[PDB]
Amino acid sequence: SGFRKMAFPSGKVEGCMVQVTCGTTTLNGLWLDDVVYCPRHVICTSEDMLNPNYEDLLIRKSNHNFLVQAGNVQLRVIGHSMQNCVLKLKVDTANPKTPKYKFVRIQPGQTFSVLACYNGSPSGVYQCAMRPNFTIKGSFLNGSCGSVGFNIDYDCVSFCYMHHMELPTGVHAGTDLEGNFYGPFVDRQTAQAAGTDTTITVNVLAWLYAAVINGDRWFLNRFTTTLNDFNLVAMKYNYEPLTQDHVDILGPLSAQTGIAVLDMCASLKELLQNGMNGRTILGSALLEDEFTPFDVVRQCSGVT
Amino acid sequence: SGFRKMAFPSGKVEGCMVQVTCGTTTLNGLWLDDVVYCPRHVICTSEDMLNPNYEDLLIRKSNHNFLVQAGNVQLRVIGHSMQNCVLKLKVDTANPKTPKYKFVRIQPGQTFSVLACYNGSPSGVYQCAMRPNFTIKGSFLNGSCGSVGFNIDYDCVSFCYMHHMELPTGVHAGTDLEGNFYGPFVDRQTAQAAGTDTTITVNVLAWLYAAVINGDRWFLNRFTTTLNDFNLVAMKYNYEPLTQDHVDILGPLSAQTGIAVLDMCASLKELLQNGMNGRTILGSALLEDEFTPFDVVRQCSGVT
Ligand SMILES: *[C@@]1(O)C(=O)N(Cc2ccccc2OCC)c2ccc(Br)cc21
Ligand SMILES: *[C@@]1(O)C(=O)N(Cc2ccccc2OCC)c2ccc(Br)cc21
């Protein structure tokens, strides 16, 4: 027992991290097979970021201007291309440490692990969730661009995120591994505000199921509710509307605990209306929304 | 910016995880050089755990009874010995993936990363702290014994913890890598209650410094206090007494923010006396005590 914000073991991803330098700019690259992926703004000076024309800026760059270093060995760059907001540097050597992998574009509400890197070297690993306004509440300092988000299914790494920007609000924006930004952000030093950060309702319910499994039961009540009734409360507290798809994904958790999804919704409803009255749930004094129903099943069953 | 409960990149530790089986019991082992470390209760049946005599139980075990599997390859066991509560299985092959390493016995209040494993395979990684009552609030299910805690200084892995037990309260007990339990616990299925879980005061202050650095400033007040005055409040709220050593370790954080340690103590004091009034600090609605002053400096500077 016990429930923790757990990240995936990052070894498979650490083996892909490289450093990319173009002129005076250094960031992280992801080396998979004979290709290094990195944010296209590696070609920018801090001056260029106000209003860059990446196609024009790229015309001035040749293969030899992209210095790619894997630990202490230098990769030979034999090609470069821009796909959306990422650069693809074809190197002459396949990364011998390339794990089985996929590139996936995740939905808001989904969680992933971030291996924060600086100059091609990993600093740490933490769990994240793509917020409903398509930002992530990360921990990134200058030089962290190029760090990636991922999930792992047994031996396959699904890369979902690549870090590109920090909003003036201290929240983070980035792309999937095809270079497309999540949400409306652009790789430009401009005023970009994020939308409402709503709470991921399905994740809070799943975390309430994790809490009942681990002994925190005080919040369980004598009530029930309906999808429409619950959603009126969810709307008042800027929570995502719960759908029958969400009820369905919560099925296994409902099955193992014997607490019907709508009964848990009524516990959540009372907690929204009354707060926690100085109490805690799984060591938290707020309703945690960055564990999906899959993460809870995975942690509560011991999947490796 | 942004502040997260970050774990160390676990790749170096994943390369050491092996599976150990003795009879019907399977747990995790740590393979470093030509030695596999694992909890000695691998030799026990669930029946033996009520009152085991490990020396007697071990007399019945030979090298060939300890099955050690690294991924899918079988290690040949050429020796076995019991050091305190750990077994040391000498294998005929040095682990080619052994990183630079040390064995350290940490103090209460110190933090470390746990690579939770099942059958020699990593499931996830999370940050922990050795509680002042020498327990850890982990996430461990059956088969997680043998999973290790560690810190990393550049390329050197300092192993500090090895998981052995779950208390009837759902908290966790284990040893350092010499087999000595932290706190008074024994590897036996008996009533073992933990002492008072006090809050690690120096870590809360360090986390308040991390919050000021990242923009959460609302809790800063017009007051100051003294070590003795603050400690009267700390005693009332079961917080660890703050010492001049703690004030000293907080020096760099005090220096970079310009907020004197005793002024931060007065912010902490008001927060203890008044609560957070529905507000949050670094996305938490409680005072976080599992970031040491070193963890905060490391995260706020980008150490790799
Ligand atoms: C990341 O390492 C990086 O390249 N970078 C610079 C950057 C990125 C987006 C917009 C502007 C800009 O530079 C302004 C001069 C950056 C910024 C913040 C973070 Br958290 C990481 C990185
Ligand atoms: C760990 O995998 C393990 O071996 N184990 C069994 C155990 C450990 C301590 C006391 C008793 C006992 O078995 C009782 C039958 C165990 C128990 C709990 C956890 Br979280 C991990 C492990």
Side-chain angles (χ1 to χ4, degrees):
Chain A
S1 76
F3 208 79
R4 279 282 183 179
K5 186 72 61 76
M6 202 173 293
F8 285 95
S10 55
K12 281 152 191 280
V13 180
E14 292 172 49
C16 309
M17 304 310 299
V18 301
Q19 171 186 62
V20 181
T21 306
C22 192
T24 70
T25 303
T26 287
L27 41 58
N28 310 278
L30 179 70
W31 182 22
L32 305 160
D33 300 326
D34 61 344
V35 182
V36 175
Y37 300 87
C38 79
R40 69 175 178 177
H41 71 243
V42 70
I43 72 176
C44 300
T45 71
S46 68
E47 307 97 91
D48 295 319
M49 299 299 300
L50 252 193
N51 189 4
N53 188 306
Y54 289 100
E55 282 290 0
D56 290 346
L57 285 171
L58 202 52
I59 286 171
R60 313 295 144 198
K61 299 308 166 195
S62 299
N63 290 337
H64 66 260
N65 290 132
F66 294 96
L67 314 175
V68 183
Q69 188 171 325
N72 227 267
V73 302
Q74 208 70 26
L75 289 174
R76 188 169 296 272
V77 176
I78 62 174
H80 67 277
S81 77
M82 181 171 61
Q83 175 183 358
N84 302 308
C85 303
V86 303
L87 290 178
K88 290 192 291 169
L89 310 170
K90 198 193 167 171
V91 294
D92 74 353
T93 305
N95 180 0
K97 305 192 188 166
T98 309
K100 214 151 304 191
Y101 76 93
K102 294 196 147 143
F103 290 172
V104 313
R105 190 174 173 87
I106 60 171
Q107 299 293 343
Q110 296 308 103
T111 62
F112 57 92
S113 300
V114 173
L115 176 55
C117 295
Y118 299 87
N119 317 99
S121 305
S123 50
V125 60
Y126 53 88
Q127 197 77 346
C128 266
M130 177 59 54
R131 302 311 309 171
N133 61 7
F134 300 93
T135 75
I136 71 167
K137 297 183 186 159
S139 166
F140 292 106
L141 288 176
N142 244 295
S144 65
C145 294
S147 303
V148 301
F150 59 98
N151 287 268
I152 309 176
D153 209 343
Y154 171 53
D155 64 344
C156 181
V157 183
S158 290
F159 293 104
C160 56
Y161 184 79
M162 172 171 281
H163 188 55
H164 290 239
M165 287 210 310
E166 175 162 63
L167 294 200
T169 51
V171 301
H172 304 112
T175 73
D176 61 17
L177 277 287
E178 305 184 326
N180 301 111
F181 265 93
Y182 286 90
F185 319 105
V186 284
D187 46 2
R188 180 184 173 163
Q189 189 171 346
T190 218
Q192 304 180 61
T196 312
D197 200 342
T198 64
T199 306
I200 311 141
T201 315
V202 60
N203 295 4
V204 182
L205 293 161
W207 170 80
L208 290 178
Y209 281 117
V212 170
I213 293 174
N214 290 281
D216 260 305
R217 307 175 49 90
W218 67 261
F219 53 88
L220 294 182
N221 57 31
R222 307 189 154 270
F223 321 142
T224 197
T225 185
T226 71
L227 262 197
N228 293 171
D229 179 58
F230 174 78
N231 285 340
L232 285 183
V233 179
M235 167 87 59
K236 168 179 189 153
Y237 293 95
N238 285 104
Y239 260 60
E240 278 263 320
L242 206 76
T243 70
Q244 186 57 48
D245 289 346
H246 291 142
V247 177
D248 292 344
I249 296 169
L250 289 165
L253 286 174
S254 168
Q256 208 225 327
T257 70
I259 296 140
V261 176
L262 300 181
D263 294 4
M264 196 64 91
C265 289
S267 291
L268 181 54
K269 166 182 164 189
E270 297 298 296
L271 284 168
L272 282 176
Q273 286 170 349
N274 301 310
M276 296 169 60
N277 284 112
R279 297 179 289 269
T280 74
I281 298 169
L282 286 173
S284 174
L286 53 82
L287 302 173
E288 300 290 338
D289 75 341
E290 300 197 340
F291 296 97
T292 71
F294 307 91
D295 294 335
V296 170
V297 168
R298 187 172 307 111
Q299 198 173 151
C300 295
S301 83
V303 176
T304 59
Chain B
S1 76
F3 208 79
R4 279 282 183 179
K5 186 72 61 76
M6 202 173 293
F8 285 95
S10 55
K12 281 152 191 280
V13 180
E14 292 172 49
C16 309
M17 304 310 299
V18 301
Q19 171 186 62
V20 181
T21 306
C22 192
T24 70
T25 303
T26 287
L27 41 58
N28 310 278
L30 179 70
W31 182 22
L32 305 160
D33 300 326
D34 61 344
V35 182
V36 175
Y37 300 87
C38 79
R40 69 175 178 177
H41 71 243
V42 70
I43 72 176
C44 300
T45 71
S46 68
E47 307 97 91
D48 295 319
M49 299 299 300
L50 252 193
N51 189 4
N53 188 306
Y54 289 100
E55 282 290 0
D56 290 346
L57 285 171
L58 202 52
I59 286 171
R60 313 295 144 198
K61 299 308 166 195
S62 299
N63 290 337
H64 66 260
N65 290 132
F66 294 96
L67 314 175
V68 183
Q69 188 171 325
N72 227 267
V73 302
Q74 208 70 26
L75 289 174
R76 188 169 296 272
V77 176
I78 62 174
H80 67 277
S81 77
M82 181 171 61
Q83 175 183 358
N84 302 308
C85 303
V86 303
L87 290 178
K88 290 192 291 169
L89 310 170
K90 198 193 167 171
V91 294
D92 74 353
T93 305
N95 180 0
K97 305 192 188 166
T98 309
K100 214 151 304 191
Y101 76 93
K102 294 196 147 143
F103 290 172
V104 313
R105 190 174 173 87
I106 60 171
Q107 299 293 343
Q110 296 308 103
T111 62
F112 57 92
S113 300
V114 173
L115 176 55
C117 295
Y118 299 87
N119 317 99
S121 305
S123 50
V125 60
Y126 53 88
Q127 197 77 346
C128 266
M130 177 59 54
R131 302 311 309 171
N133 61 7
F134 300 93
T135 75
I136 71 167
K137 297 183 186 159
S139 166
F140 292 106
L141 288 176
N142 244 295
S144 65
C145 294
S147 303
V148 301
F150 59 98
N151 287 268
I152 309 176
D153 209 343
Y154 171 53
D155 64 344
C156 181
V157 183
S158 290
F159 293 104
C160 56
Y161 184 79
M162 172 171 281
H163 188 55
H164 290 239
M165 287 211 310
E166 175 162 63
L167 294 200
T169 51
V171 301
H172 304 112
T175 73
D176 61 17
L177 277 287
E178 305 184 326
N180 301 111
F181 265 93
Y182 286 90
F185 319 105
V186 284
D187 46 2
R188 180 184 173 163
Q189 189 171 346
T190 218
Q192 304 180 61
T196 312
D197 200 342
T198 64
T199 306
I200 311 141
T201 315
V202 60
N203 295 4
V204 182
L205 293 161
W207 170 80
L208 290 178
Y209 281 117
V212 170
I213 293 174
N214 290 281
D216 260 305
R217 307 175 49 90
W218 67 261
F219 53 88
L220 294 182
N221 57 31
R222 307 189 154 270
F223 321 142
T224 197
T225 185
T226 71
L227 262 197
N228 293 171
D229 179 58
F230 174 78
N231 285 340
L232 285 183
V233 179
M235 167 87 59
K236 168 179 189 153
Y237 293 95
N238 285 104
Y239 260 60
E240 278 263 320
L242 206 76
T243 70
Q244 186 57 48
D245 289 346
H246 291 142
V247 177
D248 292 344
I249 296 169
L250 289 165
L253 286 174
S254 168
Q256 208 225 327
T257 70
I259 296 140
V261 176
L262 300 181
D263 294 4
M264 196 64 91
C265 289
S267 291
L268 181 54
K269 166 182 164 189
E270 297 298 296
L271 284 168
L272 282 176
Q273 286 170 349
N274 301 310
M276 296 169 60
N277 284 112
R279 297 179 289 269
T280 74
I281 298 169
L282 286 173
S284 174
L286 53 82
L287 302 173
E288 300 290 338
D289 75 341
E290 300 197 340
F291 296 97
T292 71
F294 307 91
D295 294 335
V296 170
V297 168
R298 187 172 307 111
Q299 198 173 151
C300 295
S301 83
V303 176
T304 59

